[PDB]
TrEMBL record, chains A, B:
Residues 1-405 form the Ketosynthase family 3 (KS3) domain. Belongs to the thiolase-like superfamily. Beta-ketoacyl-ACP synthases family. NCBIfam families: PRK09116.1 (NF006587). The keyword Transferase applies. This is 3-oxoacyl-(Acyl-carrier-protein) synthase.
Length: 408, 408
């Protein structure tokens, strides 16, 4: 069994494209949420809040030919992955084309523009909108495929498109591929592009927030006055690497991946089950050979829905006790496929800073949520050696990831 | 490390829903390809050929409440999987809800009706078409999620939606989950529903056959006069089980899964590279600790495209040498997400019968294709102890599966 480390990290968020910039907005206490005037034209849509990425740097070599098979979600993904590879010192490295480097990546869906082209045939009886890149741009593994083609990867392609667990499932499966000796380097993460149709699927479940006139005070994970989630977009990426390989080249190491757990509720497509969420955390603890006491901080899923926040916090409290916990969805909204990767990236940053971010707009802890050490109001300084990051998605898919500090 | 066996198998195809019925149609030389008058309405669509499933049995208990989150692709998947579990003796078994049983499944896309609802907002702004099951039915992991909910699975959900490799990647990942001790039973396979938009994706690549007036003569894998693929639909499913668990209950064993290789071309998004296809077969041989000499028969991907058949057959010849080979896409067309699972199922049946099916309509072997033992005209009787089944998809995703006979 091989040990697995994180040697590169990057993300694209509504709060910025570097951890320094994002943590500066964390301290300022401002979220990426805003009212969406462009969504007034959808009359049945009750929510009008989102966390878009207004801009992100696109290097000039991402030209017309390079990006022909990329919609927004795939372009954000590949640009994010290039920054993470550059961070790791592996951009243009021989290992990328060796067969020993691969990718795990997912999103809830491909590009909605390309989905519209594919659907225009069943409606308008016309093939004129479908073109040579419609499927590449629309398909749910558009990010992973565009990455192997762009970087020339010849190892494993692991498509972990599983809605809200896409990015955490990617990290876990990439970790396993290196742990079991199949690969030496993996690009791992998730991404999602924003669309009003994406908001609609949660709006028809009455899971969205209605506070359209107060974008600055919603979503409110675990808050007694929360009224649903707000969706966002972005991308997150970790570069995972076999430990001896990383040490041999003198690489900087951000964290060690020591546990991954995943299981399934087996009950309902949308309503989570507390008991199985907690079992997933126990699977990760067992995979890491650590106990609840050894976990210093938990990054919750914490979507700000009613029964989602209750099920998660009760299970976390049952398995881990009175642990420090917070949700970054208070800042970004629910970034869907991206969330597990963005949350793992920024939680590793918290561990390396010794500074753990509170849940924004958590003012009164809901009495129906589990007894946890909710970080509120201001960042909490902790000497944390081991952290846990949890995510839960439609179909009852659960993931739990455990990361450990590395001193070099 | 655990051994992994196949204890249940099922599929739904244009040639029938039992192995006996399908093999009767093999012997008669009758494909499932037909002319599609219902596609005349799409004027820009050049191909008018497909391999639809006209009917399959749906048990009574699949009522409207049970199937409200299933489109056609998911219903075929769940029905197929129930039949496979029945075959294995595990339907309703306590292990299914124990946490030790899971699912690996994929398709190229979810239900096209649901994709249309999702695009009603993108196109006509009218939201009266999105409902509470639109995403569950449209999403590319609709089969896997519907199966965990329907059967009460609490183990791993492994979404392997990777276009043409969905079903083979599901078998391989399910096999690894058992081999590495994470699960004791896995439902594994793939599925696809037929749609004109799916044909158009290949039509615009000039990859489809235009022999619309001769459906009984096309597709023609490896044939000197082939002119592209024809798409089909269906589902395939294997029940994989840890070997000691199967033996302890006296289960019938159809095969042992002994090797899985997967890699990526890293060069082109639609045109496969021969060298990496061969490396993928080498990965499978190494995983199985067998040599080229030990492979008795190869079930080709064999889509009947110009460049695809040459790259695949040249790779096979280079890495395996002169081997018996045939393509079942000559009977079903290219069933996309289903193809790797249907082809694994029926190849295991060939092994158990000692009778290996010829490529239909392969009348003049292309001298540009590799030097192989192409089975033509009549089935070949073989005392085959080990077989290989290969699949290659968009994004240059390659899979190779090795199965071994089990004498009980």
């Amino acid at each position: 069994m091989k040990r697995v480390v994180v040697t590169g990290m990057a993300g694209i968020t509504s709060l910025g494209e570097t951890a320094d910039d994002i943590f500066a907005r964390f301290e300022a206490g401002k979220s990426g949420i805003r009212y969406m005037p462009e969504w007034e034209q959808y009359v049945d849509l009750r929510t009008k809040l989102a966390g878009p990425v207004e801009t992100f740097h696109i290097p000039k070599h991402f030209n017309r030919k390079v990006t022909r098979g990329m919609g927004r979600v795939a372009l954000m993904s590949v640009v994010c992955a290039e920054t993470a590879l550059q961070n790791a010192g592996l951009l243009g490295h021989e290992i990328l084309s060796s067969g020993e480097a691969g990718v795990a990546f997912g999103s809830s869906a491909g590009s909605v523009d390309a989905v519209g082209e594919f659907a225009s045939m069943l409606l308008h009886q016309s093939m004129s909108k479908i073109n040579a890149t419609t499927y590449i741009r629309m398909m749910a593994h558009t990010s992973a495929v565009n990455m192997t083609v762009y970087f020339g990867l010849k190892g494993l392609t692991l498509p972990t498109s599983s809605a809200c667990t896409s990015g955490s499932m990617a990290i876990g499966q990439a970790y396993e591929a290196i742990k079991y000796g199949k690969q030496q380097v993996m690009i791992a993460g998730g991404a999602e592009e924003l669309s009003a149709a994406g908001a609609a699927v949660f709006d028809v479940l009455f899971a969205t927030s209605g506070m359209n006139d107060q974008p600055e005070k919603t979503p409110r994970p675990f808050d007694a006055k929360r009224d649903g989630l707000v969706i966002g977009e972005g991308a997150g990426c970790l570069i995972l690497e076999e430990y001896e390989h990383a040490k041999a080249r003198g690489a900087h190491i951000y964290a060690e991946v020591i546990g991954y757990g995943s299981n399934t509720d087996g009950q309902h497509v949308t309503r989570p089950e507390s008991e199985m969420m907690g079992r997933c955390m126990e699977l990760a603890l067992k995979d890491a050979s650590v106990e609840a006491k050894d976990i210093a901080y938990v990054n919750a899923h914490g979507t700000s829905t009613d029964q989602g926040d209750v099920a998660e916090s009760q299970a976390t409290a049952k398995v881990l006790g009175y642990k420090p916990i917070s949700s970054l969805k208070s800042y970004f909204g629910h970034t869907l496929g991206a969330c597990g990767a963005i949350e793992a990236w920024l939680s590793i940053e918290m561990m390396n800073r010794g500074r753990f971010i509170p849940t924004l707009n958590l003012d009164e802890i809901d009495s129906l949520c589990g007894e946890l050490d909710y970080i509120v109001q201001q960042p909490r300084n902790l000497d944390a050696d081991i952290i846990m990051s949890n995510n839960f998605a439609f179909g009852g898919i659960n993931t739990s990831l455990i990361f450990k500090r590395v001193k070099q």
